[PDB]
Symmetry: C3
Subunit: 191 residues, 3 copies
């Protein structure tokens, strides 16, 4: 056992949404659990800055989070949106190899674009935002696994995009941004 | 392994939907399986009374199921919609402690009874109702974890809401209400 | 430790979509993982023929994949769309019984042919098709478990239907068909 790799259940601000900001402005909860040959994931984002908490005063919203991992499955905090590495739920040890939680590069390879679409690397789904007035808006989610390699330090990529394209803005005031839990599963690398 | 807590796979009527009814009018199927630090859930409701089975003669419908558990994860039947406790897929010395199946009070705390606060305690999704003529209608699902205590004897809360908001009612006659299976995952309490 | 039954992560053409074709024209990725009392599934289909890769030149499309298994959970290749049996992620043989990965016939019974509706044998959901120009199209998914046999040699049934009813066709030329990953869970038979 050490079948759960996660941010903790109620993390402190650990992720930067607003490009260029130097400190965290949001709280990413991300949990990756092994289950046989797949990983089951759970992700939710909570805003923690006035900028993130006023994004939903606009009708068109896109939130992006990119995670870059090294060869042993550890976050590269300089290029990732998440600035703190994930940790095993059972283990005080940070000494561990997390390759087994990573997205398979056999199912979801890195590719060089070379005229021709490569859409095997995406998961699509939906999650929701509940506004201040009670209205519920669907958020379209895209997860991309591996596919584009940005540098030589990276071995695995997991990116998230939440998009809202609404008839009218959900809010007219600042309100804590919370994306409802989005679950997904993917084929995992060997341990 | 002490890892599945459920109603059974095809339960007899075990749940009360209609306000003020004294005996079960529906069959709730609920399965909670441990997977690392999360529980994976599966839930479906089947009507077993004329009242439940004529709800979809209206175009706007809300079905509420509330589950209140004690400190060792057992159902409190007086206040809960479900009138029979859940059971382990494998049998009892003292019946048993089901606390590790419950929603985490760290991830999903109990909070003051203020309106519209703490929307991090909800999971939103969709499942479907297939009408007698074949039309498929989406049902918006809300699951509430903990958040509001109903009384001083409860330790954990899990509530389900299925909502239909159609342009035209699905049915014009009585028909067996069946919600298609809804899956969800949540951060679990320690064993 | 033999909890994954699958096609492998990047299968050769192994499925026949087009009516009356004798050899595979598509690549079905199917992974069934035990988790306590349920199976967690992941399915995606990739086209592998000009026929399959031109279906999305029409706005209305139905793709069907039917899997029929014998009493030990192995594919009957003659009748099924999948022509190669599933394999354990850790084996090598037919030294494997796969009944524990099958859909429970208590939760999803077989019923008398042609007598009633039996919507409790269906799981409905959505996945997507990303077109060559980038637009995302929702695909409605229906999974049927057990319910009706194709012949008297079959013990378990799992069928998938992906449907598109767009306002306009996704494509005007041939393009690799890919159904984004669809996850679902169901109550499993005993091992």
């Amino acid at each position: 056992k050490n079948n759960t790799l996660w941010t903790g259940p109620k993390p402190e601000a650990n992720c930067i949404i607003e490009y260029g900001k130097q400190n965290p402005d949001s709280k990413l909860t991300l949990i990756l659990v092994k289950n046989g040959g797949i990983v089951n994931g759970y992700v939710t984002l909570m805003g923690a800055s006035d900028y993130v908490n006023t994004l939903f005063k606009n009708k068109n919203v896109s939130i992006n989070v990119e995670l870059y991992f090294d060869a042993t499955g550890h976050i590269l905090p300089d290029s990732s949106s998440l600035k703190t590495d994930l940790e095993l739920k059972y283990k005080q040890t940070a000494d561990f190899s997390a390759r087994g939680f990573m997205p398979s590069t056999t199912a979801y390879p890195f590719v060089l674009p070379n005229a021709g679409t490569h859409n095997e690397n995406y998961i699509f789904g939906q999650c929701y935002y509940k506004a201040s007035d009670g209205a519920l808006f669907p958020l379209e989610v895209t997860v991309m696994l591996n596919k584009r390699l940005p540098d030589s330090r990276t071995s695995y990529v997991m990116t998230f995009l939440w998009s809202l394209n609404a008839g009218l803005a959900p809010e007219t005031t600042q309100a804590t941004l919370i994306t409802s839990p989005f679950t997904f599963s993917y084929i995992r690398e060997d341990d």
